[PDB]
Amino acid sequence: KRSRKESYSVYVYKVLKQVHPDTGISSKAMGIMNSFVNDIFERIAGEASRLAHYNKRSTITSREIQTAVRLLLPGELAKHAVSEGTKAVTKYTSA
Amino acid sequence: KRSRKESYSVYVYKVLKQVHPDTGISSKAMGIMNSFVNDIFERIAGEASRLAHYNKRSTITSREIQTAVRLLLPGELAKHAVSEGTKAVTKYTSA
Amino acid sequence: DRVKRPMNAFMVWSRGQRRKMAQENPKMHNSEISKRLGAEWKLLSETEKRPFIDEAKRLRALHMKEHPDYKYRPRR
């Protein structure tokens, strides 16, 4: 009857069981993954916000997120993330 | 009938004529002062925004601006700016 | 052989004026003469410049006759 901490703790474990079924995880490493998810969310959403302001756009669409991903993430991570993202919106729009 | 560049060019000259009546200013130095005013405005408003988010405040009042001034500006600049600011709101509230 | 653009009223007017200033000012830098000619050129009237304008126009039409399919294509 405490209020609940809204966090990304379950979904990191879901991804971990998708990618590594045998190894477990600590609690403090789950907190580190929660802080990392929130840090990367702030970076990408801040770049998307300032890009929408620089172009005088009042709407953040997937183009701004794609450009911010190409801005922040270096190397092959950028194009891998863009391919994953476009796969996700094609999945979401095909359904 | 060109659209007009909204900038702080007149008020920097007003402050300059208040503080230094004899010396003139260039145009490119006026552009530098405009860029500096916009840079400091972004710094102070960004710290005020993230402070209002960290305290779950939906309203940025003068307290957040005062705390952000004490955060960014080092040395005696902080307390000088706070004294100037409180002088300004006491002037604005006395009238 | 690349085709050069037609000379404008100022370039034509400078070709002969530029030499006039060099003979009277043969030690003057081209960089400085180019500045005084521009200052003097801005003081000519349209009637006085008209002759220069029409000749450049004629050089442009005659240039177009020699090379009709010529197109100005600047390098970006």
Next chain:
Amino acid sequence: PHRYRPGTVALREIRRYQKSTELLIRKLPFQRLVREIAQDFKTDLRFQSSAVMALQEASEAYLVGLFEDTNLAAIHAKRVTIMPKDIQLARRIRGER
């Protein structure tokens, strides 16, 4: 003949170029370099003249910052000169490698 001592002309140029605020990179070769590199990322990329002036000014600022750090690292190692290991160290300690 009376040639100057090695470095005295360098000192006069130090004081002259530090008293000067001019741009030390010619505009046409920097324009050629910028439009030579930027084709590799996208083709048909014209530049405004203010943009290449800004790139030249910022590269000037970044290189004089790199060179004052380089001379700090070189003086630290008891050397008047600059060797490329000083540039390597000044880029490494700044966290750019």
Next chain:
Amino acid sequence: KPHRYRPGTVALREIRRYQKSTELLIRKLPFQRLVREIAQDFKTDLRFQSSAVMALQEASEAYLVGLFEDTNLAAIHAKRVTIMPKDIQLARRIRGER
């Protein structure tokens, strides 16, 4: 006749075991006392959570370990191994600290 190691020989094993191990190398109670000593001068009578002093200790150890890495880079660059305080001041100066 007891057996003695050489200077530097034990030092490499200590470097290896401290780079492998992930614990904190300064004790929690002097860090609590120093943090409460410093934070008097900004506002007296502050309560420090144990997690706050631990977070300050983590970031403190991280900052000093990075500064000592840069100090070793600068001392190696000047053809030394014994680092010196001028290396610390130099590595702070290049970094944008002062």
Next chain:
Amino acid sequence: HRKVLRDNIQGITKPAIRRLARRGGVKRISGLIYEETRGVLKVFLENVIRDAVTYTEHAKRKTVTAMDVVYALKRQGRTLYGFG
């Protein structure tokens, strides 16, 4: 519960500085490193603690959480992972 503190910079000791140095890869440490490193630590703690104190004093609070220390290290550009 009233108390004033003094001379706590000697509590971070010299064979506890040597371990922080030998984590970073240092093979030999001079004698005069210790007071300079204590001063570096002092000015770093003074900056981050002053930022945390302004953070907790804006919120009308009396204690220092770890979240405000994390925000104070974020404002200096040294982000800490592991506390929320």
Next chain:
Amino acid sequence: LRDNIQGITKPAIRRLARRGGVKRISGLIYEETRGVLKVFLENVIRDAVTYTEHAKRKTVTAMDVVYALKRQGRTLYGFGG
């Protein structure tokens, strides 16, 4: 008209180092400084290209270079905000 990293000439780097307060420059500095300037312009140009490509503009304005330099911690004053 190719190989334009030799457009940044050797006297125009000696002037850049004399502004920085350097008394002597060895001969091996010019190629290293050319590579440093090359990778710096590669970063800033790639960011400005992504900026002007997001806005579907074929040219690179000055504001895009300001915004590309702001994100690396080196803000330009003077070219507008």
Next chain:
Amino acid sequence: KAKTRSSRAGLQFPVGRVHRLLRKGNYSERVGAGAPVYLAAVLEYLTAEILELAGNAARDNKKTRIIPRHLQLAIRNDEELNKLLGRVTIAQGGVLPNIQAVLLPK
């Protein structure tokens, strides 16, 4: 029968929570519907890249748990994750074990 937006994209991260954080995070007035799906995609791929290297580090160490020493090892050994997390330090992580070659004896 209706299916969740997290598995509409075929993902694990919740689209609704990242949508709510984009709304109440105050980044714009409006936000597009492709934005949280794209952001959950790049987020899920990013922690997949972290956890795969972390699991390979922990299995390489003959351990069965992910302690943050494994996260620090997986981040510092990489090249293009080291540029993403260069300024960030890791709690209880330690350093990447590497000793300069001139300190070592011959």
Next chain:
Amino acid sequence: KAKTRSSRAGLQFPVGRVHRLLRKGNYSERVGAGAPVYLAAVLEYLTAEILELAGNAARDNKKTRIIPRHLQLAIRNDEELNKLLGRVTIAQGGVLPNIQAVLLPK
């Protein structure tokens, strides 16, 4: 008769424009009325501190104009303005003229 908000505080910077930039800058949903007055105050004091040192530099150089060499001199010579503008470089500004003492002859 009504008097402007910029001179209600007795200032030069417009309170209405900084209020409008705080609104459309998307920093919060609401903004307090003391916020633009405080922000215009600290802004006006800040450019007053810049322009006073710039005028003293230009009068010290026996010039009558403020060129950005004077702004770069006034910013780099200061201590607590150098911490505010340490990362920012200045267009057509040059450097602060200072030469290391070991390069100089005896």
Next chain:
DNA sequence: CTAATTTATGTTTGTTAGCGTTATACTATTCTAATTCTTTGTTTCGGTGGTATTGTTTATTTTGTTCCTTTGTGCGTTCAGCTTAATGCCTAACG
């Protein structure tokens, strides 16, 4: 040189300080356990000074090489007003 952009007044509304309560982690105390900091006596090795060789930078002169500042014209790029479909936010309902 007159449109436009800040300022004032009343209304709604939604945010926030005041208040109460309580839980909850913080601070202090006193014991043992352990562990590690500081002293003191080896010991050995790296920073620093001093000298000599060398290697390479600088300053200069000669000879190319370019540049620079001026206006009009051509062409490609961007931008702003107007059209118009796209879409995301709000509400009600459901799970």
Next chain:
DNA sequence: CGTTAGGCATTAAGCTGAACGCACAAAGGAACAAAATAAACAATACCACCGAAACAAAGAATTAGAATAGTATAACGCTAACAAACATAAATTAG
């Protein structure tokens, strides 16, 4: 906690005329730049040393841990009342 069906009001794609921006014609030494060279001073190789830091054993003195009680404090919920967004009429100002 998370998702889904219909308005509606805001917003980005579409389109065209218009205005901007840039290259380039001649000029013709000026200003710059590459190249060859004398040599002079700086980097560096090597050597001695000496005092400074590492290593070790002992004990001291400090921290760790734990039970526990008080206890300031912080984090929950009602409530007013206050302050800020919003709709609509001047004015001054300024590019």
